[PDB]
Symmetry: C4
Subunit: 384 residues, 4 copies
């Protein structure tokens, strides 16, 4: 769009004023050559009220400048020129509508602008000396960053009672600002990148107690390695415990957008209409299995239907001998447990860290009854 | 009322003593013209015990003043005059019975009062010099705020062993107070305005993981925009997960007070007695639907009765053609699913971010059986 | 007992050594008159190993003293005399087996002892001057508390390269200790008195959102006043949500100890055996009702039996007229709903913030069937 | 393995460069005798790219050294020699793949290396003086640790405008680093050893409220002593509330590995196949009972089967007289409640803090029906 360029340009204009207006307060030698750059900035700043898509904007937009330094408006009553900086609140509020920027750019940039302003103010109540403005500005900012950040050298100290009063309030405000921002950043880096901080402690607690006990090396592996698979394939995250709070039509939408891998590639899941993909993809619950891991033994009960998405798993006999075959992508098994109401003849292991989807049984038999075509689709692969 | 004026006036009196009594300790030149303002303050402070609707009040109310400085009661035994400031505990406790004031006014104001008192105390053990009291007070407060806030210039340093002992304990206590208050405020601004801090992180976690995955732009919208609707219409808040802990008669009262919009404007909900509004307004569960969002397809099961409060939704045929009509405020639909025990003929979308109330079915059929009049009221709109 | 006196006396002995041994290192003028007080302390410290009801105790108990300063054991090899202070670990561990003391006395006392020790150490590598030991000790502790607490005056600075090396490590260690303890206390006062901090925020969140909405003044009261009743009678606390984690025999024991008020004062609950008081006092669930609050209307269903412990409640007719009677302490009602299987004729309000116990119905009818005597006890008051 | 030695040697090489390269920048007198030790380090650093099991490694591996100081490559363009230290990111990332090291060695070691580097840099923009390099290095590091750790002596101050500019940015960066690391460590020690910190507060809350009430001394004991048994035998930990998040095959594996004590030592649990130990060891729920604690009275209902692992419990009559016998390790009781469908004749107490396993009943009767052999194994001990 084009309006973001307008926001960044008005931001630049407000920074221009925040750097220049205190300098013009201290140095009346300015504002004489800058009048074109001042009138353009003033017209830009006054041409912003009606763009809604208001007190600070109205207070800053009144043309108090071009008069403060022209009519020369003596110093005790010229301190009302600072009301032009109240656009800081508006721009900080709008900076959210554009932890990297909430408490980072709104804090260190504010600290720098405030430091510049207060160094210029501390420059103002000094006796008129004979030194270059640049080196005096560096010295003033040096003293300012010394007392604002709580260092305390003391090579520059107040001498007049009015400067001693000013240094009381600047000491208080600066050590408040320093402590505030530093404590905020310290409490925020303990929240920054909250995925590695929360998840790694999730691993720490479990690991800690299982290593308080003693566990075999071939079970020490696959524990830290299941956390590694959940750290690399899933990046420290289970899914369902975080997706309850998202609404029911929103679990429908997010789940049909995300679980696009399992559906419309196996002949069961392609061409299966639409009331499935809303009804069952929320019930589509994934699990992860490691290498050489058993699920069923010979003839157990409650053997739900196993939908393999990717990965190859061998099927063998009840014993280790007489290799049957390989089952791989694009197919499924596990179905003649409930449709045939019969005990089972199957043995399963896994080659590697395989992903397999495990859905419940009562909803399965509830929904297959409402659909002759796809229960028949199950049925030919059941019978042949 | 009038008693709050009495609390603020006694607060002013205690501040008056906290500022003045150390000054009279250091400067015996006072207390001579202030005797009217001292007797009125003393009578006001002693006329507060019986107003219950007690150790600090009794200890402060004893007339030790008007004698400490009259009989002149030499300095080592005059330090018991400080027992009059123990009303600080009482006023700080009562300040709750009147995070903007719990750890803000009880901390910075306490810091300022303590700073004044300890600067006056540090003034006390100085050699008698020849300087104005005002500039010496500013210098003493300057050194105090220098060492209390941990800056460390060093232009003013102790010289006598007794002053070196006093500066040990004031250094310890001041750096304790500084660290305490600054760490408290730093940990409190991470709790201050806890709605934007908690909710924005609620958005952050979800957004973070859904953007760790990749989601379509027309589904990137309505996610952040559902959070925007929950941030502007609801201000970052779901309702039921926070209202369990409120008691059952209190969910009755709060819910009948709050959900006054849905009831007594549709002819179902007006004139419907009272045992409804207690029985069902807790079961009145709201949901939000975005533009162009489906709910039902053609003839599904379990189509509960839809109560639309505000907003207009179109009804069309099973296909996109042959526009039926507009359904809008003041009415309802969704009813012939359970009363007629029949499949459905309806298609629904939404124009915008519409609010719709979704209540359960088993309680509905439980309560409609106990009420002939209002099930009949449902029935004419069902039949005609 | 007597052994706690022994622990406090050995604690005093360890403090005696921690204060005195560095002084004897710096000042060899000591240890000459203190030999009785040294031999008694040594015999007390060596007579502590066998009292189990061990490395630091054994390392401290070896008689290296009485030889370090007698044979004079030149200074570079005399630094092993500090191994006697390792009883600090043992006493800090035992201080739990005796937030007011876990991170308070183990931190500020440790800071003070460490400060004393390191000030004496900084005294050790100084050129031999001619000043009183007291004022030099105050000056050394002054510099120490200046650099340990990060103040930085600079009136005392290192001059020799070895003192510059020592001040590097003491600066590092002292600013580590200062930051550690101050951040710990700042994070602990945000946990200190965790009942007012957790509960008041519990009130804050609810109050905040109900005042984000608008609620009537006669419902603004009884909300904050129900929190006041839960803050004064219960002190910010519900009961059952915290007593699940306590085990089942332990809910039996704690509940029969605590709920001694409701039982054995009404004729139902006295003389009722024992298998009740274990079976039902966990199911004894309390609720609180405010003034003038309705529960039932005329003839509703599911009117469980109401056990009033204390407080008087009026019973009136279905309308406001024809006052029936007062029901008060020592009795109960609510019973002919389930035993007679009949609709109800009752109206109830409450005079004030009354406490009433509400138990479930299925367990009630399960247990009354196993007990003829007490269901009969219910029965006469039901029938007469 | 051998590759960890390679990582520690390359770590030593990177530390060698981080200490030496700034010194060679400041002191061109080096690099002349070190050429063998420089060529070996360079060949080691360039022989690390292909060992995957990449921008910093490639940028550091380019042979910019051996030319920077040979061709003498004048000072303003020689600052690109610092790009060799970017292996810090790689080694800090790999330090996790090898709270004692996450935010401890990555922070204090980084602080020390940064301090050395910035002290050498501050040495660089000094006028050429005539002092030994060692004492000047100590003085520079002294000033650096003074301003980096926010102490502020002031014996060494900048004089040139360029040094004043450098001290502005080093003051800012150093007080940022100091505050960051110290606040991080302060917030981490409140998380460090999170077992004693979390559990002791678990004890604190309960103890606090039960001591807000008043509880008998023989019930004050066994409360703190049940927490002591859970603190010494279990180390502040219940089991099931933390093992839900571990997956179902993983509760199978972890539970069969951990609960190896109860199984295969009583004749019930040995030789019982395998589908038990997966089916019931997750349902194997442990409880702890203290001395002299009742469970059943005479003839109650729902007396599940009691599996005693270790400890001896007496059985007596319904009254205190006529001692029956001792029941001890290797056996079980509690079985004729459900198999015989009969009321009970038993009384039980406990000698000490005994561990007993309590499993549910519906799964027990569900699984015993599928197993004739082991229900018969139950049956002979039931009948004889
Ligand atoms: N001849 C065969 N060789 C290998 N696998 C088979 C064979 N016949 C059937 N199967 C699969 O083995 C599975 C075991 O029973 P299921 O119900 O899981 O579904 C079964 C089929 O998918
Ligand atoms: N002729 C019509 N045109 C538009 N809407 C209708 C018409 N007749 C009924 N409806 C509504 O359409 C809804 C679809 O079925 P419901 O049970 O939800 O309730 C129905 C009625 O409220
Ligand atoms: N004559 C009466 N006057 C006042 N209260 C009564 C009278 N008779 C019965 N009650 C009580 O009124 C209660 C209303 O029905 P309950 O089942 O709650 O138990 C009833 C009795 O305890
Ligand atoms: N003669 C006996 N002396 C002691 N204990 C017995 C005797 N006979 C049975 N028991 C045990 O007492 C227990 C009480 O009933 P249970 O069903 O718990 O299982 C019973 C047996 O294990």
């Amino acid at each position: 769009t084009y309006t973001l360029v307008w926001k960044v340009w008005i931001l630049a204009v407000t920074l221009y004023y925040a750097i220049r207006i205190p300098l013009t307060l201290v140095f009346p030698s300015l504002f004489s050559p800058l009048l074109p750059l001042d009138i353009l900035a003033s017209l830009a700043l006054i041409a912003d009220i009606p763009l809604d898509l208001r007190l600070p904007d109205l207070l800053a937009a009144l043309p108090l400048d071009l008069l403060v330094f022209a009519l020369h408006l003596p110093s005790p009553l010229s301190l009302l020129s600072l009301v032009r900086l109240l656009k800081l609140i508006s721009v900080q509020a709008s900076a959210t509508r554009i932890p990297a920027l909430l408490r980072l750019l709104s804090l260190v940039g504010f600290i720098l602008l405030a430091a510049h302003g207060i160094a210029c103010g501390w420059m103002s109540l000094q006796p008129p000396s004979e030194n270059p403005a640049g080196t005096r500005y560096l010295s003033a900012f040096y003293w300012t960053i010394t007392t604002l950040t709580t260092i305390g050298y003391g090579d520059i100290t107040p001498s007049t009672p009015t400067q001693t009063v000013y240094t009381i309030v600047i000491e208080l405000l600066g050590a408040a600002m320093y402590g505030l921002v530093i404590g905020n950043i310290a409490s925020l880096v303990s929240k920054l990148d909250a995925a590695k901080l929360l998840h790694r402690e999730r691993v720490e607690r479990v690991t800690a107690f299982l290593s308080y006990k003693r566990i075999s090396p071939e079970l020490q592996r696959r524990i830290i390695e299941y956390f590694d698979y959940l750290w690399e394939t899933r990046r420290g995250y289970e899914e369902r415990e975080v997706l309850k709070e998202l609404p029911h039509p929103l679990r429908l939408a997010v789940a049909m957008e995300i679980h696009g891998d399992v559906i419309e590639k196996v002949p069961l899941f392609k061409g299966a209409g639409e009331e499935f993909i809303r009804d069952i993809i929320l019930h589509l619950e994934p699990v992860i299995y490691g290498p050489g891991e058993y699920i069923i033994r010979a003839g157990e009960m409650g053997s739900d239907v196993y939908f393999i998405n990717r990965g190859s798993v061998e099927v063998l006999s009840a014993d280790e001998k007489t290799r049957y075959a390989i089952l791989s992508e694009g197919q499924f098994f596990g179905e003649m447990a409930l449709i045939l109401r019969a005990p089972r003849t199957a043995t399963v292991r896994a080659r590697a860290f395989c992903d397999l989807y495990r859905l419940d049984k009562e909803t399965f038999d509830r929904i297959l009854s409402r659909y002759p075509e796809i229960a028949a689709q199950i049925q030919e692969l059941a019978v042949r």
